[PDB]
Amino acid sequence: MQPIALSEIVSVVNTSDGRLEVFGVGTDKAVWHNRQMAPHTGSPWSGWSSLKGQVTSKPVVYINTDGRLEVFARGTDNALWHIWQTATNAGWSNWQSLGGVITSNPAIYANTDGRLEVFARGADNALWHISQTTAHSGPWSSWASLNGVITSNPTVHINSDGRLEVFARGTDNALWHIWQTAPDSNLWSSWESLNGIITSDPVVIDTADGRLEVFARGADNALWHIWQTISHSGPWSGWQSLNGVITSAPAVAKNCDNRLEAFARGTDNALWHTWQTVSHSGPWSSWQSLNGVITSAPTAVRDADGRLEVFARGTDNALWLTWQTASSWSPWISLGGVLIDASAIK
Amino acid sequence: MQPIALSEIVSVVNTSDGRLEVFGVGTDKAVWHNRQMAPHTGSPWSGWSSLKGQVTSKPVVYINTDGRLEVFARGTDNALWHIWQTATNAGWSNWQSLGGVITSNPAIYANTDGRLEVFARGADNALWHISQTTAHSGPWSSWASLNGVITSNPTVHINSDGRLEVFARGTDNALWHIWQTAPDSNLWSSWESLNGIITSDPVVIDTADGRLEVFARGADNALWHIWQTISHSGPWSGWQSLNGVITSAPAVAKNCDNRLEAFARGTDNALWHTWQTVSHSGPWSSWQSLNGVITSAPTAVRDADGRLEVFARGTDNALWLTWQTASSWSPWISLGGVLIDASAIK
Ligand SMILES: OC[C@H]1O[C@@H](O)[C@H](O)[C@@H](O)[C@H]1O
Numbered sequence: 001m002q003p004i005a006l007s008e009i010v011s012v013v014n015t016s017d018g019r020l021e022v023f024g025v026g027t028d029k030a031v032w033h034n035r036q037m038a039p040h041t042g043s044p045w046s047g048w049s050s051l052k053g054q055v056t057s058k059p060v061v062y063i064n065t066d067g068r069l070e071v072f073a074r075g076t077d078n079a080l081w082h083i084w085q086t087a088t089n090a091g092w093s094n095w096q097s098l099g100g101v102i103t104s105n106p107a108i109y110a111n112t113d114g115r116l117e118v119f120a121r122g123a124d125n126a127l128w129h130i131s132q133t134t135a136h137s138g139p140w141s142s143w144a145s146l147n148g149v150i151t152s153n154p155t156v157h158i159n160s161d162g163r164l165e166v167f168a169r170g171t172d173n174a175l176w177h178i179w180q181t182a183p184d185s186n187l188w189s190s191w192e193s194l195n196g197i198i199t200s201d202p203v204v205i206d207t208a209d210g211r212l213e214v215f216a217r218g219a220d221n222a223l224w225h226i227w228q229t230i231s232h233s234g235p236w237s238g239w240q241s242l243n244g245v246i247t248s249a250p251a252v253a254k255n256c257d258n259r260l261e262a263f264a265r266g267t268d269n270a271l272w273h274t275w276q277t278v279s280h281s282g283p284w285s286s287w288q289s290l291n292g293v294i295t296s297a298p299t300a301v302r303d304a305d306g307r308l309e310v311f312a313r314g315t316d317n318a319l320w321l322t323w324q325t326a327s328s329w330s331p332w333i334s335l336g337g338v339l340i341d342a343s344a345i346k
Numbered sequence: 347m348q349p350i351a352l353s354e355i356v357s358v359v360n361t362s363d364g365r366l367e368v369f370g371v372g373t374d375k376a377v378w379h380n381r382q383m384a385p386h387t388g389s390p391w392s393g394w395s396s397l398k399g400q401v402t403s404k405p406v407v408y409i410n411t412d413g414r415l416e417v418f419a420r421g422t423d424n425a426l427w428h429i430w431q432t433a434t435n436a437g438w439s440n441w442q443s444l445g446g447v448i449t450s451n452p453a454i455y456a457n458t459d460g461r462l463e464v465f466a467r468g469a470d471n472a473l474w475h476i477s478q479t480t481a482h483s484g485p486w487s488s489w490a491s492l493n494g495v496i497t498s499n500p501t502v503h504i505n506s507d508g509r510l511e512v513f514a515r516g517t518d519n520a521l522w523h524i525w526q527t528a529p530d531s532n533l534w535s536s537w538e539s540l541n542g543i544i545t546s547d548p549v550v551i552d553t554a555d556g557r558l559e560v561f562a563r564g565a566d567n568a569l570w571h572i573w574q575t576i577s578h579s580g581p582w583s584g585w586q587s588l589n590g591v592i593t594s595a596p597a598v599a600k601n602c603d604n605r606l607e608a609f610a611r612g613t614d615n616a617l618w619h620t621w622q623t624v625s626h627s628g629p630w631s632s633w634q635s636l637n638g639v640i641t642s643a644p645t646a647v648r649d650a651d652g653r654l655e656v657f658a659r660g661t662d663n664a665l666w667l668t669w670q671t672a673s674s675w676s677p678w679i680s681l682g683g684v685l686i687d688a689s690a691i692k
């Protein structure tokens with residue numbers, strides 16, 4: 001490679017053959033990726049290679065329901081572009097334009113019928129969407145708006161009953177959401193407020209008991225969360241603080257026992273974390289340090305051995321990596337590269 | 347409730363809200379079920395209640411891609427019948443016939459497009475299939491044959507690239523298989539032999555690195571296995587023994603770190619098990635005893651806390667249950683009921 005709260009520097013996925021693979025942007029605006037040779041914690045890595053392209057957003061990988069990876073990014077023309085594996089353990093297509101004019105990172109999820117649907121902000125700050133017309137396949141539909149006025153990147157997650165739901169910060173800095181009223185459809189609710197005051201993009205997970213749960217940095221730079229009180233349904237809970245003082249977006253992942261764990265940069269620029277204790281319904285630990293000096297939010301993912309691995313940019317712009325060991329966490333190691341923050345909303 | 351190697355006595359699922367739920371048959375041939383109140387190991391259970399019906403196969407539950415449970419069973423007329431939740435956290439439809447004449451338990455899997463496809467043996471011992479025409483929905487297609495001559499219940503599993511693949515014992519007692527050549531299609535291979543000599547139904551998993559792997563009791567009543575050597579592809583490995591002397595079908599589940607674990611009844615009628623050590627690519631432990639006196643194969647499943655829970659019938663015909671603890675395994679507890687072995691092939 002050539003020499004809102006702060007964003008994640010990469011998009012990551014645990015692939016259909018149990019390998020972690022990360023996607024980032026270099027100084028000349030190409031998308032690069034790096035992947036484990038082997039499905040295990042501490043595997044050697046491929047090194048960075050270029051998928052080319054010229055991007056003005058975070059590149060966002062999603063796995064099709066046939067296992068083919070696909071990467072979505074905004075182009076220098078502000079259209080949505082994508083590139084995909086032509087077969088599950090094979091090479092990549094060329095970049096192709098899906099048109100439109102977008103003003104955020106793209107957010108992607110599979111409908112229950114295997115059709116990817118992509119969400120992105122438009123020039124008037126409304127939310128727009130486009131989708132595959134058949135399972136993991138073009139042609140794509142035409143773009144349409146779900147309205148709203150949003151001031152963060154959008155985040156999408158499917159409910160435990162198959163209904164897509166999108167979250168985003170509003171002009172007032174509250175968290176807003178909107179949802180399919182039926183799976184696989186274009187029947188959507190009105191936008192509704194979940195109040196609060198957020199200063200990062202929202203991070204969304206579906207818990208082990210089927211409740212959507214949203215994490216976000218608050219006005220006070222603590223980590224807050226809120227959730228559906230019953231499976232795939234409102235009413236929502238109150239906003240609740242998980243404390244901390246954080247200087248980047250939060251990342252959240254599930255341990256293999258479904259204990260949630262949140263990661264974020266601290267006031268000392270180290271990686272900090274907090275996790276549920278004992279089980280997925282337990283209380284949260286105090287924030288604790290994983291050291292390092294990082295220049296992006298962290299990106300967390302669970303690997304094929306069931307361990308959380310966390311990636312973050314260093315002061316040198318290389319991507320570094322630390323992972324859970326039986327005892328503790330490993331010392332940071334460098335994967336090299338020279339990565340830039342290409343987020344469409346900063 | 348009213349007062350090949352041996353089969354499993356129940357079908358089990360970890361539901362979309364993290365609850366285990368089991369389905370069995372009573373003396374009067376109705377399908378009954380029992381489920382955890384709460385998404386945790388050692389949760390209280392509902393007790394047994396009847397979904398009615400009159401069945402002559404194991405009832406087999408599958409979770410639609412919108413989270414609705416659906417149960418498939420052969421009727422006393424030898425047709426395939428089914429019943430489904432009308433909404434993800436709600437009640438059940440009535441039993442409805444999908445017609446045909448079948449001579450095995452049904453085997454079910456979701457295509458990459460969300461369409462359930464059901465496989466079952468016919469009156470000439472060929473394999474037949476029928477499917478939903480749209481994602482998690484009727485109407486259903488008409489029945490069609492994939493030929494072959496089979497002498498065990500069939501087992502289906504999707505490859506890590508979205509291709510369905512069906513396994514079954516042949517007239518010669520070898521393991522045979524057949525596969526989609528493309529996802530979501532009716533384009534299937536010829537039947538092909540994987541040789542060996544098997545004396546149970548095949549049990550199939552997809553490993554953490556995307557390889558199908560099949561377990562079966564051998565001629566010598568040891569547990570054998572065989573696998574794809576690369577992700578979603580032949581060539582297959584040699585048959586390899588995991589030893590043991592087993593008096594029921596094997597059940598296999600993944601620990602939350604992806605270590606495979608096999609369970610089966612022993613010569614002393616206790617539950618025995620063997621597991622991969624250290625990680626998902628590790629070697630297998632020696633067989634060890636979990637006690638009990640059981641009158642069916644075990645049924646294994648991983649719960650919402652990431653623990654394996656194992657169910658088996660007792661000498662009294664109640665369903666008993668034991669689960670992993672931090673240290674060890676819990677003492678057997680009774681869930682009651684009076685369950686019969688209704689398997690269409692014994
Ligand atoms: O040509 C449009 C492309 O759309 C992608 O989303 C799909 O994964 C590709 O297979 C191709 O159809």
Ligand SMILES: OC[C@H]1O[C@@H](O)[C@H](O)[C@@H](O)[C@H]1O
Nearest residue numbers: 165179228232233234235236
């Ligand atoms: O808060 C009310 C709404 O909550 C949403 O999260 C849910 O998807 C809707 O179906 C409705 O329940």
Ligand SMILES: OC[C@H]1O[C@@H](O)[C@H](O)[C@@H](O)[C@H]1O
Nearest residue numbers: 255261275308324327328329
């Ligand atoms: O460093 C201490 C902590 O590390 C976390 O990742 C893990 O979830 C906790 O169980 C505890 O081990």
Ligand SMILES: OC[C@H]1O[C@@H](O)[C@H](O)[C@@H](O)[C@H]1O
Nearest residue numbers: 410416430478482483484485
């Ligand atoms: O009426 C046919 C039924 O087929 C089931 O497989 C489906 O889950 C039901 O919703 C219903 O369509």
Ligand SMILES: OC[C@H]1O[C@@H](O)[C@H](O)[C@@H](O)[C@H]1O
Nearest residue numbers: 511525574578579580581582
């Ligand atoms: O053994 C040869 C075959 O093995 C199957 O398991 C696989 O699904 C096929 O695509 C082909 O590779």
Ligand SMILES: OC[C@H]1O[C@@H](O)[C@H](O)[C@@H](O)[C@H]1O
Nearest residue numbers: 601607621654670673674675
């Ligand atoms: O009883 C001893 C064994 O129990 C198994 O279920 C588990 O996979 C092993 O890790 C070991 O604990």
Ligand SMILES: [Cl-]
Nearest residue numbers: 026028029030
């Ligand atoms: Cl570059």
Ligand SMILES: [Cl-]
Nearest residue numbers: 122123124126
């Ligand atoms: Cl707009």
Ligand SMILES: [Cl-]
Nearest residue numbers: 204205206207
């Ligand atoms: Cl999630």
Ligand SMILES: [Cl-]
Nearest residue numbers: 339340341342
């Ligand atoms: Cl930068």
Ligand SMILES: [Cl-]
Nearest residue numbers: 372374375376
């Ligand atoms: Cl009964």
Ligand SMILES: [Cl-]
Nearest residue numbers: 468469470472
């Ligand atoms: Cl037939």
Ligand SMILES: [Cl-]
Nearest residue numbers: 550551552553
């Ligand atoms: Cl599996």
Ligand SMILES: [Cl-]
Nearest residue numbers: 685686687688
């Ligand atoms: Cl019986």
Ligand SMILES: [Mg+2]
Nearest residue numbers: 014015016018
């Ligand atoms: Mg994977």
Ligand SMILES: [Mg+2]
Nearest residue numbers: 360361362364
């Ligand atoms: Mg579940």
